[PDB]
UniProtKB/Swiss-Prot annotation, chains A, B:
This is Killer cell lectin-like receptor subfamily B member 1B allele A. The keyword Transmembrane applies. The chain holds residues 93 to 214 of 223 of the full protein. Receptor for CLEC2D/OCIL. Ligand-binding contributes to inhibition of cytotoxic natural killer (NK) cells. May mediate MHC class I-independent 'missing-self' recognition of allografts, tumor cells and virus-infected cells. The keyword Transmembrane applies. Its main location: membrane. It is found in: Membrane.
């Protein structure tokens, strides 16, 4: 199904942003649409979105972050990141937030501006 | 099922906040938990949460707002509000946001601070 201007794929709907924003701003944005940032299901899904976002270049925020007090990478669903379901690359001496480039997954400052993608589940 | 410190009810899990915040801050908060603000299902559900939040008093933000350029009340899922599935009370000369008190549902400035509740669906 999905709504107008969102792209369907398996049991999920995606909306790619038209602007770039901080990680926390992107949380508020997908929140106002009754959605969340991305919980990556497969390397298949990561392929599909990498294509969809090819034209935009940029690298898009996902629902995955590192808070220094936790001492670990965590998806917004509460699960710890599996390092070889998905391999994040970059430093972690501060709170960081993950984005997905064409070739990598990046630890970045949560105050960087990136494109984001929102998901809703059918 | 649900996770630790969330309350189950029908097919939904709820978490009540421990602080009070603006509407947009609450969007970011439930976003970081892979959740959304409340989409009220029944007057049954509004009863259950009004009890759960009885001890906090206060009035909790929900996933419903009015943006002046739209000219109508809309849930975060995109649907327009049915005024007698749920009746909102208060003015609308500016963008507003809805909270649920013990007796009413209130139009408020989106910059007010309220308690909020996040929902995940099983
Ligand atoms: C929190 O979100 C993360 C990211 O979506 C979830 O991680 C994903 O969990 C699924 C389901 O358990 C994993 O899929 C599995 O793949 C193997 C095939 O190799 C198969 O044996 C299983 O039947 C299943 O399909 C998936 O790999 C995994 N993705 C990543 C990137 O780690 C996590 O489950 C979520 N937490 C929940 C739903 O509580
Ligand atoms: C967007 O969210 C709102 C708030 O959750 C949804 O409104 C709710 O929609 C449901 C399902 O259509 C309504 O329930 C219906 O109740 C009558 C009994 O009077 C029954 O005939 C139907 O079988 C159904 O159970 C519910 O009243 C309604 N709640 C409110 C407060 O309006 C709306 O559906 C959501 N949009 C979606 C899912 O796209």
């Amino acid at each position: 199904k999905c709504p107008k201007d969102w792209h369907s794929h398996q049991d999920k709907c995606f909306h790619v942003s038209q602007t770039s924003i901080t990680w926390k701003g992107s949380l508020a944005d997908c929140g106002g649409k009754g959605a969340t940032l991305l919980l990556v299901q497969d390397q298949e899904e990561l392929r599909f979105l990498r294509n969809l976002t090819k034209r935009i270049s940029s690298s898009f925020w996902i629902g995955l972050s590192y808070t220094l007090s936790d001492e670990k990478w965590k998806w917004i669903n509460g699960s710890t990141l599996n390092s070889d379901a998905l391999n994040i690359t970059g430093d972690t001496e501060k709170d960081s937030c993950a984005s997905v480039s064409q070739d990598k997954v990046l630890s970045e400052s949560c105050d960087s501006d990136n494109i984001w993608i929102c998901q809703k589940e059918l």
